Amino acid sequence: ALRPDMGYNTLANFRIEKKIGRGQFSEVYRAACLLDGVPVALKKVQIFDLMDAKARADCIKEIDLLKQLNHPNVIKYYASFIEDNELNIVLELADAGDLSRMIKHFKKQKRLIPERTVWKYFVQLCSALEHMHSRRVMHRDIKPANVFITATGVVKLGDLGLVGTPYYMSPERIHENGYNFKSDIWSLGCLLYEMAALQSPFYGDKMNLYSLCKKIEQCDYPPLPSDHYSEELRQLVNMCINPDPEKRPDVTYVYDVAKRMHACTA
């Protein structure tokens, strides 16, 4: 059926086109609204038995804070509702593709990324991450697969969240301390590395869940080429993955560095 009285607040007002979202943790489909006609993507959480009352209310607690966020580099959250005992969220469409796939493109090509373009996208990201840190919200999970670039080139970021593993593990997310802001930029620091090396900084020789942690605790990661990447960057990455969080910068300083270095490369 169809009900315009509840615009964006029911799957009855959406024609799902493709399951453009991979994985079994959640299914994200690209759809088209049957009213205004704008294409939108919906995200379904199978939280019927995946979450418990104390958690269900905790998750609905976060999407509302996230709703209060208007930035051209953060994805627009249009509506939230629950039908079929599953959580539904409809946000802006990023059809062009993710940065994770954008890395793989070059990785298969065997042609590394120029220092000129990584700033072209990175600054945009920090702009967002600061806008979120301005509202005292943290992305929680910054990975190349959640940073979406449009066909035009604008940069927008995705959502947040048998041993489950975040892509970039914080040195404080190991000793089980709280996920603070200065850990949200740890993930961001490792992100800059992945664009210049096209693979995580701690991606292990013989993947080992434990040595990876000491490698994170000791900060023993493979340096980058002295020839192709500005030393401001190779020192900006090493500055953002300092184990002790106090010794790390704040988002806005990384924003400052990203901006000025973005103009020197043009």
Author numbering: 21 to 181, 196 to 300
Please share text taken word for word from the publication where this structure appeared:
The NIMA-related kinases (Neks) are a family of Ser/Thr protein kinases, first discovered in Aspergillus nidulans that are conserved in eukaryotes. Nek7 is 1 of 11 Neks found in humans, and contributes to the assembly of a robust mitotic spindle apparatus. Human Nek7 is a 34.5 kDa protein, comprising a singular canonical kinase domain made up of a small, 5 β-stranded, N-terminal lobe linked to a larger, mostly α-helical C-terminal lobe. The intervening cleft between the two lobes forms the ATP-binding pocket and active site in which phosphoryl transfer takes place.
